Design an enzyme around this catalytic site. Structure first.
Site, short mmCIF file in Angstrom:
data_model
loop_
_atom_site.label_atom_id
_atom_site.label_comp_id
_atom_site.label_asym_id
_atom_site.label_seq_id
_atom_site.Cartn_x
_atom_site.Cartn_y
_atom_site.Cartn_z
N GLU A 154 0.91 -1.13 0.00
CA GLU A 154 0.00 0.00 0.00
C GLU A 154 0.97 1.19 0.00
OE1 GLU A 154 -2.50 1.84 0.14
OE2 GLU A 154 -4.04 0.34 -0.45
N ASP B 169 -5.32 11.59 7.05
CA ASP B 169 -3.96 11.15 7.31
C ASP B 169 -3.59 11.31 8.77
OD1 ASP B 169 -3.18 10.37 4.66
OD2 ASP B 169 -1.21 11.26 5.03
N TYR C 270 -11.07 -2.57 2.41
CA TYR C 270 -10.29 -2.03 3.52
C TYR C 270 -11.17 -1.95 4.76
CZ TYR C 270 -6.77 0.98 5.85
OH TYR C 270 -5.83 1.51 6.71
O1 LIG Z 1 -1.36 3.88 10.41
P1 LIG Z 1 -2.26 2.61 10.69
O2 LIG Z 1 -3.03 2.71 12.01
O3 LIG Z 1 -1.31 1.31 10.86
O4 LIG Z 1 -3.25 2.33 9.45
C1 LIG Z 1 -2.71 2.41 8.08
C2 LIG Z 1 -3.18 3.73 7.45
O5 LIG Z 1 -2.46 4.83 8.02
C3 LIG Z 1 -3.02 3.77 5.91
O6 LIG Z 1 -3.73 2.68 5.27
C4 LIG Z 1 -3.53 5.12 5.41
C5 LIG Z 1 -2.76 6.13 5.00
N1 LIG Z 1 -3.60 7.21 4.60
C6 LIG Z 1 -4.85 6.89 4.76
C7 LIG Z 1 -6.00 7.68 4.47
C8 LIG Z 1 -7.30 7.12 4.71
C9 LIG Z 1 -7.43 5.80 5.22
C10 LIG Z 1 -6.24 4.98 5.52
C11 LIG Z 1 -4.92 5.56 5.24
#
Ligand SMILES: O=P(O)(O)OC[C@@H](O)[C@@H](O)c1c[nH]c2ccccc12
Ligand SMILES: O=P(O)(O)OC[C@@H](O)[C@@H](O)c1c[nH]c2ccccc12
Ligand SMILES: *Cc1c(COP(=O)(O)O)cnc(C)c1O
Ligand SMILES: *Cc1c(COP(=O)(O)O)cnc(C)c1O
Ligand code: NA
Ligand code: NA
Lengths: 250, 364, 364, 250
Positions: free
Chosen positions: A49, A60, A175
């Site tokens: 990803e 974010d 997701y």
């Molecule tokens: O940081 P986490 O808690 O491990 O989850 C991943 C997430 O940050 C990544 O998939 C992501 C980056 N930007 C996003 C924007 C919307 C949804 C999800 C995201």
């Protein structure tokens, strides 16, 4: 090329879960970033990803936002990201590559043109963070036309009607934001639990809950954020984390 | 699926993470209910009147127009509690939050105008306000520390957006809670001149004070609607805040509208002598009114705005906000460029310029 | 020989050099004429309404009085153009000057409140203003450089006194041009409560905003009139501004009234956290109302006023002037000292406290 | 003792005008002030006009105001002024002494008590600068009871009714502010022209106009204001000025 369909097939035959790490392209720099990604894959990442630095990332997290600043500080641009993406695909032909985008960067020079570029470099999926299912029509139609899987987030406060939409509009994988039965009931794409995933036990719990895998971002980025002055130790720690997380999915 | 159309032509929408849709849908539903509820209207009208100070006056400026065939009226929102039109919509949004059973307000501000307005409303209606003038906010109990916080607390907290922009139904709600500006202006002008204005002019930062003045005149085809964006140091210099006419359509802040961004798609910053007009985008309804030619938009530079600021002080004894000075500046141009043209104009004086007493001082 | 009684009991008079009597006599005559002239009233009313923003609101404070049998209303002069009640009387005096064929205004100010008010009025009515906020005055064309100048120029210039003090007919004129405060308050309270207030409270610096609120209630014996002088650091410390109750009768500034002077007869200075209440004396009508027991006067210290300032900000979302905070402070005391006493009070909020944002900040 | 009545009588027999200088008591200091006054008298002053330092002198010119500041700076007080006045009278029994006062200093400890004090030290007249004829009743009644002449200013913009009042209420002399026939027509006290008198020719012009004399203040004070660092030269210049001005009245 149905990389997601192929991956889940192989993973299910080995009765294993998928472990998908997330990192920002160009963080802390183009050269170091490409090395990070190769370490993640060699360590056992099943899919990737990747985020493209954007000026105003709404959904974010803090750890992720700092990654964008480091990327921008390095002079990273969307154009350079696609150059990296082509390089990554050239070294790894089967690993599924998903992008985490923001609406403006996709709409900027034309929605259809953006997905055409993804298909050209080898991208498999695109998740537009600030585009809800209610506003997804033009994005997912363009994605499908260019063989790109449109990824949708299924929130915890989601009702039945949203589950059906996400199941019908989604492709590649769903997701799952930290319900799995309902998704499978509607034949949704394999679910991957994200948000908060930072320990091996969480990955096992996810797979045991019924998910096809788990996504981890903040944890991954944090390792980079604490080893900027030691590139070597950075890759070393990344390999250990990824190796442990993936071992938990088996 | 929504109760109201989220779009104005191609502009508008709700481009926010999925997790925030329930909050937006809930808000639209409560708004639709409140709008049909006489009890809500009476409460809102009571605050505006006995607390905010409405109706605001409509002042005719005879000294400024002397020697020309221009008749100029200024809608006095500078006389509203707080010193700006902002108060109108924060009171309404504050009441909506209570109608939804919420007890906390979430907001953010740049200069501090909107921050202060939200704090004053929160103190009055007994709401816990958290904001991201700093002393004025704290003095009113407001906690100075956005959408992220609202994501996981919207069940008990309301996000008080400060302009007619952002995701639906904010553009629509901010307009309705500011439309009394135009409604009053119409009744007042008909009483004083016995006819409608030839044109109403207002500065466009986010578009809230402008849409509040425009709204009630939209169906009056004979009435011109003129929005004035900040030109900063000059459009050609690139350092300005006129995205509607000199920007490019993009998706940001939960909406599709004209924006100031790089060729790559990275949102840029908007410059202006007046911080209040620093919004790098503009409300979707304005983009739409422009597209069909119902409303016209122009820009005024810092020097022109400054000149309008000095001119109103010496000829009318009123100190306007640098933001409102951009609107006045265009009206003066309309007058000066064609002194023998008979026209009845109304400039929305969105706020007082006491806060710009130092800014204008240094420039001098 | 005058048309109106120059005295209020033993207080008042015209103790000025002989050379200034013609100016005072002329002023009284013009005032008497203007008061009977419907045309003058209509012009004055028009400015107050369409320029100043009258009528001002009457706000009920329910948060501040919660838990007690006190109902508090605040007369919103802070919502008047300029941010203070001062504007009311400067507009009237400005019109009187024009009625007398004068084209120049002479004035002086300490903090700058009255200076700004005279300048704004002068800019509006096309008058050459000379004054002895400095930027605000200059921004409005006012020349920042008194009675001496008026001595040899009163044929073309009017002296715009800033309070209900000085030689006749100033005390009387300032009251009449400020009495709409009380007239509005009466109509508003009767509409909201169906009865008259138990008491009206206003701060007393010079006595103008207080007499403006009192005037219309003087014949309503049941209504209490409470004037609040500044106590500064405390009456017993000597550093205060409460001459009416803690001063001594003398002759100064063209009048006989309570004054703060040395045992020798040398006028002293009055201290207060609020510069606006620095007048070392007080209007003659107030001295008189006190002597016969019609009005009662008390004092409030800086700490009490400061506390009232903070309390209104957090509980009502209104930032009052430190001057007006003295009035609010006494009302709070009336409430707090006897929480079970049923009483309907009205505090004249003479002005906004945005100007006191720094003063209160440092103290904190 | 009718010092004014006696002075004008003698002056008229010698067909001369009166020259009355004005100075602030205690300026620049008690000691130096007393010396100034003795120099003024020795030089030929026919009468004296003395001011008592007041905190807020309305009708006080700029030059005069500075004199008050110098007096206050020296620590001069009304009580000390009366001490000086008694000393001046003890050295000069016939010279008319008039005071220039402000209302509060007279009203302070009682109007009647103030004039009683003037009569005790030997004062001949009192002019209350901020008390117009319309508010003079209590002051002039108290003055007359204590054999003190109440002096009134007759402005240039004075009408007929004011002339009659000033003529009826005034005693000692009429302060004519820079009309003499009308005053004499109403039997007013001898007129003394004041304001602007700084040259010998002005004193002659005044006497020729019909006035009994002229008063000079600013000019006198100015000499003091420009010789503070040279007490001796101060008295010297004062003597010359006064001598010339008085010579013009002969
Ligand atoms: O940081 P986490 O808690 O491990 O989850 C991943 C997430 O940050 C990544 O998939 C992501 C980056 N930007 C996003 C924007 C919307 C949804 C999800 C995201
Ligand atoms: O200074 P001149 O122009 O020479 O005039 C004397 C005058 O100052 C003196 O008589 C005086 C002092 N104080 C006053 C107050 C009022 C009237 C007159 C006076
Ligand atoms: C904040 C502000 C504005 C900008 O807002 P809009 O939403 O464009 O009205 C305009 N005028 C004043 C006085 C302001 O304080
Ligand atoms: C100047 C001022 C006062 C003092 O004047 P009064 O003549 O005593 O009314 C009171 N309140 C405000 C807000 C002022 O600006
Ligand atoms: Na904008
Ligand atoms: Na006072």
């Amino acid at each position: 090329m149905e990389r997601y369909e192929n991956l889940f097939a192989q993973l299910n035959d080995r009765r294993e879960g998928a472990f998908v790490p997330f990192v920002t392209l160009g963080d802390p720099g183009i050269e170091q970033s490409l090395k990070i990604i190769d370490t993640l894959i060699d360590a056992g990442a099943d899919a990737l990803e990747l985020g493209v630095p954007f000026s105003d990332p709404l959904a974010d997290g803090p750890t992720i936002q700092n990654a964008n600043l480091r990327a921008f500080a390095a002079g990273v641009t969307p154009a350079q990201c696609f150059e990296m993406l082509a390089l990554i695909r050239e070294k790894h032909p089967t690993i599924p590559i998903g992008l985490l985008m923001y609406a403006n960067l996709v709409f900027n020079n034309g929605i259809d043109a953006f997905y055409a570029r993804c298909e050209q470099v080898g991208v498999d999926s695109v998740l537009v963070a600030d585009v809800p299912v209610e506003e997804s029509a033009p994005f997912r139609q363009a994605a499908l036309r260019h063989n790109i899987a449109p990824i949708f987030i299924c929130p915890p406060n989601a009702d039945d009607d949203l589950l059906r939409q996400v199941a019908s509009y989604g492709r590649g994988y769903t997701y799952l934001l930290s319900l799995i039965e309902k998704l499978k009931e509607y034949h949704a794409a394999p679910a991957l639990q994200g948000f908060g995933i930072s320990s091996p036990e969480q990955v096992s719990a996810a797979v045991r809950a019924g998910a096809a895998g788990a996504i981890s971002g903040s944890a991954i980025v944090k390792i980079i954020e604490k080893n900027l002055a030691s590139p070597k130790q950075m890759l070393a720690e990344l390999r250990s984390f990824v190796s442990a997380m993936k071992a938990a999915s088996r | 699926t929504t109760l109201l159309n989220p779009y104005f032509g191609e502009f508008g929408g709700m481009y926010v993470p999925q997790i925030l849709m329930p909050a937006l849908n809930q808000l639209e539903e409560a708004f639709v209910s409140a709008q049909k509820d006489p009890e809500f209207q009476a409460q809102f009208a009571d605050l505006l009147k006995n607390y905010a100070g409405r109706p605001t006056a409509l002042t005719k400026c005879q000294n400024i127009t002397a020697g020309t065939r221009t008749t100029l009226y200024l809608k006095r929102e500078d006389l509203l509690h707080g010193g700006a039109h902002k108060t109108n919509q924060v009171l309404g949004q504050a009441l909506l939050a209570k109608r939804m059973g919420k007890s906390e307000i979430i907001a953010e501000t740049g200069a501090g105008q909107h921050g202060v307005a939200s704090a004053l409303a929160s103190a009055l209606l007994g709401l816990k306000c958290r904001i991201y003038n700093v002393f004025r906010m704290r003095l009113m109990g407001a906690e100075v520390i956005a959408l992220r916080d609202w994501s996981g607390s919207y069940e008990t907290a309301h996000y008080m957006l400060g302009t007619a922009a952002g995701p639906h139904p904010y553009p629509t709600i901010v307009r309705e809670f500011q439309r009394m500006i135009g409604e009053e202006t119409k009744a007042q002008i008909l009483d004083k001149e016995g006819r409608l204005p030839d044109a109403v002019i207002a500065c466009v930062g986010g578009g809230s004070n402008a849409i509040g003045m425009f709204a009630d005149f939209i169906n009056d085809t004979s009435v011109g609607l003129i929005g004035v964006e900040p030109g900063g140091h000059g459009i050609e210099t690139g350092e300005h805040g006129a995205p509607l006419k000199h920007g490019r359509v993009g998706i940001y802040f939960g909406m599709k509208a004209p924006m100031m961004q790089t060729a790559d798609g990275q949102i840029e910053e908007s410059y202006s002598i007046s911080a209040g007009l620093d919004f790098p985008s503009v409300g979707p309804q304005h983009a739409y009114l422009n597209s069909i030619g119902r409303a016209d938009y122009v820009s005024i530079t810092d020097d022109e705005a400054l000149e309008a600021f000095k001119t109103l002080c010496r000829h009318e004894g009123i100190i306007p906000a640098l933001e409102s000075s951009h609107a006045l500046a265009h009206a003066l141009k309309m007058m000066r460029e064609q002194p023998e043209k008979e026209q009845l104009l109304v400039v929305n004086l969105s706020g007082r310029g006491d806060k710009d007493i130092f800014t204008v001082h240094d420039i001098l």
